[PDB]
Design a protein around this ligand. Structure first.
Ligand SMILES: C[S@@+](CC[C@H](N)C(=O)[O-])C[C@H]1O[C@@H](n2cnc3c(N)ncnc32)[C@H](O)[C@@H]1O
Ligand SMILES: C[S@@+](CC[C@H](N)C(=O)[O-])C[C@H]1O[C@@H](n2cnc3c(N)ncnc32)[C@H](O)[C@@H]1O
Ligand SMILES: [Zn+2]
Lengths: 262, 56, 262, 55
C-alpha cells in the first residue's frame, strides 16, 4: 500500500491542482475532509470509493477530545494503507497547513515502511493575500494558532501582518468545543493590547467555499472582537500597528541609508 | 432533487462560465434552471439556505 | 478589456489549479513569468498568444533599476487591457506573493475602471511545508524578505519556523556592491546570532521545478551560511531555537494550569 | 521535443508519475529518452537537461 495526501483548496472544484485531482481519480480509496456537501458530491463523482473522515467527529451530543478524533482519523487511513490500498487523503486547503492528520499519517506510514508523501495545496492564507490585495512580501507575515498564542509564550512583530488561526476556539483548553466564550476572547484582547491599541482595526476573514459566494472581510476594532460572530472557518488578521524603524548598525555596515530605502 | 450542485461544480472549474456569470449572474443562473428561491439565496448571500435547497 | 492574474505553482504543468488553467486556455493574450523553458513550452501549447515578461529584464549590463523593469512589465500588461483584450498574467507560484507586478497591474487597472482580479496559487512556502514535513501551525511561523529583515528592526520569535526569502540578494541595493555574498551573509549571521547560536542548524531550500527533479534541502550550521552557494530561487529556513514554554500569565487569567490543557 | 512532452505528461498525470517512481529508467526509455538524457536525470544535472532540449 501507499499514501498520498492532497489538498483541494477552499473553492469548490476549481482550486485543486491538476496533479492532485489526478491522484484522487486514480486512487483505490479516498479519505476526505471537505468544507460542505457540494464538495463531497464533487469528490464522489471523481472517485466513488470515499470514506468521509467527518464521521470521526463527535455526534449525537457526545463529548470527545479532538486529539482522539485525529487519532481515529489517522488509524482509519493507515488501516487502508496496511491492507495494501493505494490510499489518497483529500483535505481542504493545503493538507499540511494547520492540519495534523496528514503529518501524523505520513510520519506513521514511513515508520511502518510505506511510501508516503504530501502534495501542497492552496491554503486559507493563500486565499487571504489574493482577496485582501496584500502582498505578504511587502512587510512580512506571521501565523499562530490563537489558543497556542494564549497558552504558550509567543511575541508578535507589530510591524508585520499577524494571522491568528482557529480564532473561534481561542482559549478553549479542553479541545471538545467548536466555539469559545466571550470572556476568553476578552482575555485575548487584553493580551494583544501589549502591542495593539484597543481601537486598532482588525479583520475577520473567511475565504469563500462556493463560486457564487463572496469572502467575508469584516473590519472592526480589536475591542469588539469578544462580541463578533466567529465560525470554525474564521481567521483573524491583525494588520501592523507600529511603523518600521531603521537598523542603523546594519545599514552602516552595508553602506546604505534611509535615503535609498522607504 | 435539484441542479444546484451540478451548476456550482461546473461554475467553479470553467473560466468561460465564471466570466459569463460575473457578467450577468441572474441570467446565467436562470439558464441553468435555478429556482427563484435559489437565485434569491445566492443574491442575498444566504449559504445556509442554499445548502437546504440542495438535499442535505 | 479585463485582467486576471493566476499562479502556475513551482512544478511543471501539474501544480496549477484547474480553474487557473482554464483562465489561461480562454485568454485573448497571456503575459508569462515562468521558471524555465519546459514551463514556457507547456504554456504555449495551452495558449499560443503569449508575451514573455522575461524580455523586460536588464541585459547587456544596461542600466535599469528593477523598479523600471516592473514598470515596463506593468505597462505592457495594461496596454493589452486598455486595448480591449481579455488579458491573463501567468506567474510562477502564487501571483500575489513577492510579486510587485501583479499587485501594481491590478491596482492600476482598477483605478482605470477595469475588472481585475487575482487567483491564488501554490507558493514556494506551500511547497516547503510539504517537502520538509513541517506544519507552520506546530509552533507558528514568520516570513520576511531577507533584505527587509536586515534593513529594519524585526525581532523574530525563536520558537517559530522563520523563513527568509530572497536570501541570495540579502542586503543588496544598487549602489555599493558587496556582491560578496560572503560579506553580506556574515553580517546577517552576526545579526541572527542575537537570538540563534552559531551552530544552530539552518536549511537552504529550493523547490523542484521539474517532475524528475529532487528539491534542494541542504542542512548546515548558521556559521557556515556565508560560504554557501545561493541561487535566486533559494529560500532560507531557520527552525526554532527554543521549545514552547507555558504562558503562566495567561493561564492564570484563564484560571487553569498546564495539567488542564487537553 | 519528446523530452518536453514527457515532462509535461509526467507532471500532470498521477498514474504515469507513480509508474515513473516505481521504475524511472524503464519508463524513461519507453518514452524514448536518450541514454544521456536519462543519465542527466539520474545524476540530477538540470543544467545539461536544458542543453539536451534547447532552453
Ligand atoms: C484545521 S485548520 C485547516 C487549514 C487548512 N489546511 C488550510 O490549508 O487553510 C482550520 C483553520 O483554518 C482556517 N480556515 C479554514 N477555512 C477557512 C476559510 N474558508 N477562510 C479562512 N480561514 C479558514 C481558520 O483559521 C480555521 O480555524
Ligand atoms: C520574486 S519572489 C517569487 C515568489 C513566488 N511568487 C511564489 O509564490 O513563491 C522570489 C523568491 O521566492 C522564493 N522562491 C522562488 N522559487 C523558489 C523555489 N523553487 N524554491 C524555493 N524558494 C523559491 C525565493 O525566496 C526567491 O528569492
Ligand atoms: Zn505563511
Amino acid at each position: 500500500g501507499s499514501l498520498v495526501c492532497v489538498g483541494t483548496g477552499l473553492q469548490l472544484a476549481g482550486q485543486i491542482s491538476v496533479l492532485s485531482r489526478s491522484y484522487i481519480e486514480h486512487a483505490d480509496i479516498v479519505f476526505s475532509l471537505l468544507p460542505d456537501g457540494f464538495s463531497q458530491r464533487w469528490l464522489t463523482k471523481l472517485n466513488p470509493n470515499v470514506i468521509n473522515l467527518q464521521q470521526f467527529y463527535a455526534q449525537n451530543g457526545e463529548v470527545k477530545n479532538r486529539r482522539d478524533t485525529y487519532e481515529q482519523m489517522v488509524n482509519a487511513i493507515l488501516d487502508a494503507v496496511r491492507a495494501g490500498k493505494k490510499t489518497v487523503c483529500a483535505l481542504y486547503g493545503h493538507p499540511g497547513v494547520f492540519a495534523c492528520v496528514s503529518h501524523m499519517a505520513i510520519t506513521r506510514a514511513k515508520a511502518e515502511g510505506f511510501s508516503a508523501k504530501m502534495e501542497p495545496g492552496i491554503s486559507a492564507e493563500a486565499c487571504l493575500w489574493a482577496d485582501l490585495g496584500i502582498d505578504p512580501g511587502n512587510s512580512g507575515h506571521q501565523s499562530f494558532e490563537a489558543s497556542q498564542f494564549m497558552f504558550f509564550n509567543h511575541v508578535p512583530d507589530p510591524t508585520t501582518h499577524l494571522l491568528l488561526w482557529q480564532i473561534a476556539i481561542a482559549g478553549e483548553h479542553t479541545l471538545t468545543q467548536f466555539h469559545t466564550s466571550s470572556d476568553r476572547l476578552q482575555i485575548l484582547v487584553e493580551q494583544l493590547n501589549q502591542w495593539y491599541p484597543l481601537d486598532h482595526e482588525v479583520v475577520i476573514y473567511e475565504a469563500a467555499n462556493l463560486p457564487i459566494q463572496a469572502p467575508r472581510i469584516e473590519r472592526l476594532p480589536l475591542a469588539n472582537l469578544p462580541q463578533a460572530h466567529l465560525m470554525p472557518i474564521s481567521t483573524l488578521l491583525i494588520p501592523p500597528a507600529k511603523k518600521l524603524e531603521y537598523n542603523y548598525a546594519i545599514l552602516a555596515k552595508l553602506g546604505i541609508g534611509p535615503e535609498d530605502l522607504g | 432533487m435539484s441542479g444546484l450542485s451540478d451548476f456550482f461544480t461546473q461554475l467553479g472549474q470553467d473560466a468561460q462560465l465564471m466570466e459569463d456569470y460575473k457578467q450577468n449572474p441572474e441570467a446565467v443562473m436562470r439558464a441553468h434552471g435555478l429556482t427563484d428561491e435559489q437565485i434569491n439565496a445566492v443574491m442575498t448571500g444566504d449559504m445556509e439556505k442554499l445548502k437546504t435547497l440542495s438535499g442535505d
